[PDB]
Amino acid sequence: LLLDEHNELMRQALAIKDSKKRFAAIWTLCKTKMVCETDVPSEDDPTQLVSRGGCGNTQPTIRKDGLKLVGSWKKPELRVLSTEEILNIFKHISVKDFTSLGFNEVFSRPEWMILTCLPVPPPPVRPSISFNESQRGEDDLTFKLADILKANISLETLEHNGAPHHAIEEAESLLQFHVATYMDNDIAGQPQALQKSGRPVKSIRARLKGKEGRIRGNLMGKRVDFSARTVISGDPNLELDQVGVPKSIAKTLTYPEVVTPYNIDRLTQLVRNGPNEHPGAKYVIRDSGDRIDLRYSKRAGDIQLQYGWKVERHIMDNDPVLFNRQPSLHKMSMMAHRVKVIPYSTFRLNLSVTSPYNADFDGDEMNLHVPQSEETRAELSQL
Amino acid sequence: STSTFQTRRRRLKKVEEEENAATLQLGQEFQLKQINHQGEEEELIALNLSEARLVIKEALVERRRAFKRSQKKHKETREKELESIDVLLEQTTGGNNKDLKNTMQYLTNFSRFRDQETVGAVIQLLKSTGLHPFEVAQLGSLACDTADEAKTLIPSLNNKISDDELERILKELSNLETLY
Amino acid sequence: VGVLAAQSIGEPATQMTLNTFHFAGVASKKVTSGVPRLKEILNVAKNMKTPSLTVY
Amino acid sequence: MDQEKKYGMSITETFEKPQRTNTLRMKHGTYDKLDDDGLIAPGVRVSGEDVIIGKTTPISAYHSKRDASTPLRSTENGIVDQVLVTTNQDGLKFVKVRVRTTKI
Amino acid sequence: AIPKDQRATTPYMTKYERARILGTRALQISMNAPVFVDLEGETDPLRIAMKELAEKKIPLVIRRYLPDGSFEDWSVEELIVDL
Amino acid sequence: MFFIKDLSLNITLHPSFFGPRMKQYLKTKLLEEVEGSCTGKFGYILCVLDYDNIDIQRGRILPTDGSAEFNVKYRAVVFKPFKGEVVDGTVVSCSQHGFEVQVGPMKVFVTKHLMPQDLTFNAGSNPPSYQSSEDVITIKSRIRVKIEGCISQVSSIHAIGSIKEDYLGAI
Amino acid sequence: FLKERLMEASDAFRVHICGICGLMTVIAKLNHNQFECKGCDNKIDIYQIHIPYAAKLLFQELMAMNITPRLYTDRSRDF
Amino acid sequence: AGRAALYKEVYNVIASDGSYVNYRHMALLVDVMTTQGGLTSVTRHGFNRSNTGALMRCSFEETVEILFEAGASAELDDCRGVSENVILGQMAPIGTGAFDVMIDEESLVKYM
Amino acid sequence: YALATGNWGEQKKAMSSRAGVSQVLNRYTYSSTLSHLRRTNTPIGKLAKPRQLHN
DNA sequence: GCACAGGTAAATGGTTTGTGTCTGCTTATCGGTAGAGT
RNA sequence: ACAGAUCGUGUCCAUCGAGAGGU
DNA sequence: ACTCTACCGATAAGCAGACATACCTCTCGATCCTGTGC
Ligand SMILES: [Mg+2]
Ligand SMILES: [Zn+2]
Ligand SMILES: [Zn+2]
């Protein structure tokens, strides 16, 4: 390191428990130094000096230019710092040095920031787009990986067969640019990567950058099953906690009920009804999956329900469901109501619940969610 | 199924200090000063060939007696030994229990001590030295004639025991195994 | 309680009407109030539009 | 709308009623209302996923032809009133159909 | 780390605890677990769970986790239900 | 060589079995589970001693279903073939590859390349064995064999044996 | 309810994670009932977790970014 | 004094629309904003620059920067927040998840 | 291409060209068609002054 | 007879009404003492 | 020795931009 | 005593970075070729 524990300022800086703050302090204290010392006076008796043990060579002023680092060597030489020498220097860093700098000797070494073996994502990460008519449209990641492979092969052949240093430099620059665009297509001060279509290529950073990303668009927010949405309307004859569910929605949405001695007859009657009338069932689940369809098999009636099975019955009356309006600002925008089947294709609610919902009947749209387990049903009813 | 939590950077130790060795270097699970369920800092228990057979036999008869009392409350030499543990195993453990037969047969065939007093005094005799209980179990189980056999049998006893004391307790064990 | 507090603070923000002007008393100082004032308070702006001081 | 678009030279789609014998991965909608030419005559009530235009494309085991029919919309139904057949600029077949419904 | 004489938590039973206990009992009853009370002809697992909670016949233990990591165990029958 | 360790086991019990007999249900579950096990870490489990104060802790209920997870504490006799350990057994099988040993419940193999060239496969004798000089070895005879190492940590557990050592064979 | 909506009513995936590496690169063969981790030749500690498919895709993308999101089933504290 | 002034300013902000907000919410907000020794703005340069988990932090602002920072360092995410459990698809330790439910043998044999 | 996609320019560099110049005619109602045929748009992209009704 | 494979195009010069509000990096600029005399 | 026409279940047409909308 | 010039701190002022409520509905286009081959 440029500075060690001998310096009082360095000793004071090497006391912050936080890694980021300690690294920032070390960088601020060491960026001023531009030459190895090798002879640091001791804290006590400043007249006598102590051999630090360094090299004594001067340090350059590293400057970032595009994807390359340049160094103004002045005692001015302007030599571009190669990646190989930087990696070699990083490999020579002692464990304590980057431990104090913030890096961990087990999980993230400083020398591991240099790419020497790039893994490729599996086909699930970059699937094949079927697209209308039989054409094998491929993801941009596959094209970028193929480009990187081609650049690597070209560089290897150019190095093996013998070529001037300019060809090696341009090949390695092209490979570095392609790798960087594969990992980040929004590099500042650099031209974007364009394919044959002329549009900017899609990078994984661009894949997860905003509210359409993997985290803000597929992790904390996602599409769900067993949900419905239709125009709401008023009904003074309904109760305060009651929602008018259309017959079609009730026949579509289903709730899985485990067959029990207390409801065996009811479940058998619902199964015999079939997925045509509202008080019916759509699916019968036996042991170890093996779903049974009640609308294609038609084998209903001659099927005996054994204990432990599951029956996907239609949404019946007094079923607790979640009723939501967007935007959901406060917790009152989410409420649990009781299902009441109505003979019209609209949502009916009491007039007194419109104020917490902040909704009217001029064309509003509201969503309905049903639970799929006893845990969720009970907690929705009681909370 | 484990009894020790992660420690000393077990996630990415990246040392790979082999798997086992004759000169100590025991496995991590079988390490000195084990952790008891309620206590702590308890050393590893090592059982000789004779001690283990007595332990399993006593556990089996205890389980059989417990089962018999529950049912009631609800309502030679080597040849003779084989019948005894056969009739003990045929009803106590139950199930397939195929593996248990071979272990018990090997214990009975290779048993060194058959007297309760002798095996009990074995620990009292061996407690004089501070040797690791594994090697004392090895010398108690394996036969010997003098110091050369004990030294050649295992490589974990290099200059760890004085020859005079070694030959002394080797002859002690020799007579304690020849008296029965 | 944190989510409840956040919702209870943000709901009146959406429910408020225009808050760009009309915040003047005896002297038309155009004191900032409402949504812009709340935004500059949350962002902790070092240069507010209408700094003020009261002396007793 | 549908078109008899051509791939290469010999890979040209055709308008005909598909059959189970030589069509693979075909839709499960009803094909009874279709005619020999592959179009529904005007005045026939349609509903659900019923196929209105029957088009098949050559694959290149048999099953040399694969269907490309466009079914009616799931939430739409009615009676077909006008069916228009013509040719595009290059010389292929152009087919347009219309569905009429009353919304009380 | 399970003190008994130094239990500083409230003896009352929270709404979240009540909802969780009722849901767990209802789910167990639905999946054919033994019932320790008579049903009076009832056939809905949730109401059976409420009936069991009424007379404190639910064999469950609440483990309240302190922020540091310690915890204390409260029985359902010993928790006062007032809400 | 025999050790006793305070092992731990995790089991899941269906709530349909949540009766007064849960303790004995878990007891028999453990009893048939750890008996005859061939775990690659602990080794061979032979007997489960100390059938008292098992101390079955409270069973945490998984949020997904009504099942409860139990962490039972128990001690049992273990058996692991430590590498480099001298053991004594009996010969069971003897092919042209070598003669096997019956140390405990294992099938330790003394491959032909381990013991010296003195031992020869003489098929003339009625029991196929390796009759040679320096004492007589046959099927079901006393033999002391060392362990070179542990292989096949998964599924069955066994090792490889050798006789090329002073004061190791014959006996 | 939040967990049910995020998992049961949406993507739900089961993966095997090595107990040493902490990554999901575990070779699982359910037919022969055996598992292996070629990274650290581990065969006697394999755990299965239930995570959404989006989380698995994000972790795989992060691994493609030379970033290791190691997942562990135990709490690391004290020693 | 700064916290009190901030609370007074917020109360004056919510004063003209006629809406009334309980003191607890605004007090909690100003205490969070002044937990450290200075003002903590509600932005990417304020409460973001904290010691909380990277997964829960990176779900609001730009993500790949903090992910790269986490990769460069070796910080441990305790996964005790809500965002981490939502990402991992597990029951967050909030509300009904703040406790654990266990079954006892003594009470089980007590009833029957 | 310009009259179909609505991007006023050549096939390439369409990202830097204006969009929405050409739109499909709205024929839901005669009044709607008349309104669509007499529509003007100022490309601006936060600012309240340009949106205000000037004197 | 028709297909087959690399990114050889523009050099340029060039663009656009009216986006603020912090954030960090990199200079330029301003005082203030220390190696000592006649 | 033995040594098959398809059958039977079959999965969808996607992505990127642009415009018009309505609470 | 302050000249001949060095690092300390304390600002000004230009250079870029991040991002803008939520819900869904519908239609409409585009996803390559020209110099080069015998
Ligand atoms: Mg409205
Ligand atoms: Zn140096
Ligand atoms: Zn591993």
In chain B, domain spans: 1-46, 47-71+77-180
**CATH superfamily of the F1-84 domain:** RNA polymerase Rpb7-like, N-terminal domain (3.30.1490.120)
Q: What is the CA angle G41-G46-G51, rounded to 5?
A: 125
Judged by DSSP in three states, A232 sits in strand
**The domain spanning residue A276 has which CATH number?**
3.30.1490.180
Among the partner-chain residues A260, A378, A383, the one whose CB lies closest to the CB of E32 is: A260
Ligand nearest to the backbone CA of A366: 1
What residue spans of B75-146 are helical by DSSP H? 78-89, 98-109, 116-126, 133-141
Residues of chain F with CATH 2.40.50.140: 85-171
- Tokens encoding H63: 């993500």
Tell me, in angstroms, the distance from the centre of ligand 2 to residue A55's CA: 4
Q: How far apart are CA A203 and CA A147, in angstroms?
A: 14
Q: Which CATH architecture has domain B47-71+77-180?
A: Up-down Bundle (1.20)
Pairing of strands A347-349, A227-234: parallel
Side-chain-side CA neighbours of G54 within 13 Å: the count stands at 22
Q: How far apart are CA A349 and CA A296, in angstroms?
A: 36
Cα B34 to chain centroid distance, Å, stands at 16
The domain F85-171: what is its CATH number? 2.40.50.140
Q: How was this structure determined?
A: cryo-EM
Contact A356, A335 (CB under 8 A): yes
**Distances in whole angstroms, Cα of residue A220 to Cα of each of A125, A216, G61, H88:** 20, 6, 17, 10
Cα E12 to chain centroid distance, Å, stands at 12
Q: How many CB atoms lie within 10 A of CB B121?
A: 13
- Tokens encoding B29: 């699970």
Resolution in A: 2.7
- The gap between the terminal CA atoms of chain E, to the nearest Å, is 30
Judged by DSSP in three states, G35 sits in strand
The separation, in Å, between residue H39 CA and nucleotide J27 C1' comes to 30
- Tokens encoding F43: 């080794």
Domain count, chain E: 1
Judged by DSSP in three states, B118 sits in helix
- Tokens encoding B111: 């048993």
The helix or strand, by DSSP H or E, that contains position A260, with its residue range, turns out to be none
Q: Minimal CA–CA distance to F47: which of B79, B138, B62, B31?
A: B62
Q: How many CB atoms lie within 10 A of CB F33?
A: 15
Contact C29, C37 (CB under 8 A): no
Place of tokens 């909802």: E19
**A69 φ/ψ angles, rounded to the nearest 5 degrees:** -110, 130
Residue type, E57: K
Collect all residues of chain A within an 8 Å Cβ-Cβ radius of residue E19: 378-379, 382-383
As a whole number of angstroms, the longest Cα–Cα distance in chain I is: 41
Q: Minimal CA–CA distance to B149: which of F162, F144, F168, F164?
A: F168
**The domain spanning residue E11 has which CATH number?**
3.90.940.10
Tell me, in angstroms, the distance from the centre of ligand 1 to residue A364's CA: 5
Write out the residue range of the structural domain in which residue E47 sits: 1-83
The alpha carbon torsion through A348, A351, A357, A360 (nearest 10 deg) reads 80
Q: Minimal CA–CA distance to F157: which of F84, F76, F48, F79?
A: F79
**For strand K, which nucleotides have at least one atom less than 7 Å from a protein CB?**
5-7, 10-20, 22-23
Contact F110, F162 (CB under 8 A): yes
Q: Is the CB of I51 under 7 A from strand J?
A: no
Strand partners, F71: F10
Q: Minimal CA–CA distance to D55: which of D95, D84, D82, D100?
A: D95
- Do residue A369 and residue A307 come from a single domain? no
Say whether residue E75 is in contact with chain F using an 8 A CB cutoff.
Answer: no
Q: Minimal CA–CA distance to F2: which of B114, B118, B137?
A: B137
- Do residue A73 and residue A50 come from a single domain? yes
**The domain spanning residue A365 has which CATH number?**
2.40.40.20
Contact H28, H7 (CB under 8 A): no
The separation, in Å, between residue A186 CA and nucleotide L16 C1' comes to 14
The helix or strand, by DSSP H or E, that contains position A131, with its residue range, turns out to be none
- b/e for B13-51, b at 16 or more Cβ within 10 A? eeeeeeebbbeeebbebbeeebeeeeeeeeebebbbbbb
Q: How many CB atoms lie within 10 A of CB A119?
A: 10
- Tokens encoding B68: 């018999």
Q: Minimal CA–CA distance to A321: which of A231, A207, A208, A244?
A: A244
Q: Is the CB of C43 under 7 A from strand J?
A: yes
DSSP state of C7: H
Q: How far apart are CA C17 and CA A228, in angstroms?
A: 33
Residue type, E16: Y
Cα H110 to chain centroid distance, Å, stands at 42
Q: What is the CA angle H62-H63-H67, rounded to 5?
A: 140
Pairing of strands A310-314, A281-285: antiparallel
The helix or strand, by DSSP H or E, that contains position A85, with its residue range, turns out to be helix A83-91
Q: How far apart are CA F137 and CA F94, in angstroms?
A: 11
- b/e for F88-126, b at 16 or more Cβ within 10 A? bbbbeebeeebbbbbbbbbbbbbeeebbeeebebeeeee
Contact E64, E9 (CB under 8 A): yes
Strand partners, A366: A230, A325
Write out the residue range of the structural domain in which residue A351 sits: 226-252+316-383
Strand partners, E71: E65
**Distances in whole angstroms, Cα of residue A134 to Cα of each of A81, A128, D93:** 49, 12, 21
Pairing of strands F8-13, G27-29: unpaired
- Tokens encoding H36: 């450290």
Side-chain-side CA neighbours of G3 within 13 Å: the count stands at 21
Place of tokens 């494309």: D57
Residue A107's Cβ-count burial label (10 Å; 0-12, 13-18, 19+) is middle
- Tokens encoding B90: 């045929």
Q: How many CB atoms lie within 10 A of CB D66?
A: 18
* Contacts for F90 with CB less than 8 Å, ≥ 6 apart: B106, B109, F101, F102, F140, F141, F142, F143
Judged by DSSP in three states, A297 sits in coil
- b/e for E19-38, b at 16 or more Cβ within 10 A? bbbbbbbbbbbbbbbebeee
Angle (deg, nearest 10), helices B78-89 and B98-109: 160
Place of tokens 């003669």: F99
Judged by DSSP in three states, D68 sits in coil
Q: How far apart are CA B155 and CA A273, in angstroms?
A: 80
- Do residue A247 and residue A257 come from a single domain? no
Judged by DSSP in three states, E30 sits in helix
- Tokens encoding A92: 């020579």
**G46 φ/ψ angles, rounded to the nearest 5 degrees:** -130, 130
Strand partners, D87: D93
Contact H10, C40 (CB under 8 A): no
Q: Minimal CA–CA distance to G71: which of G25, G22, G13?
A: G22
- The gap between the terminal CA atoms of chain D, to the nearest Å, is 27
Q: Is the CB of I6 under 7 A from strand K?
A: yes
Strand partners, A292: A284
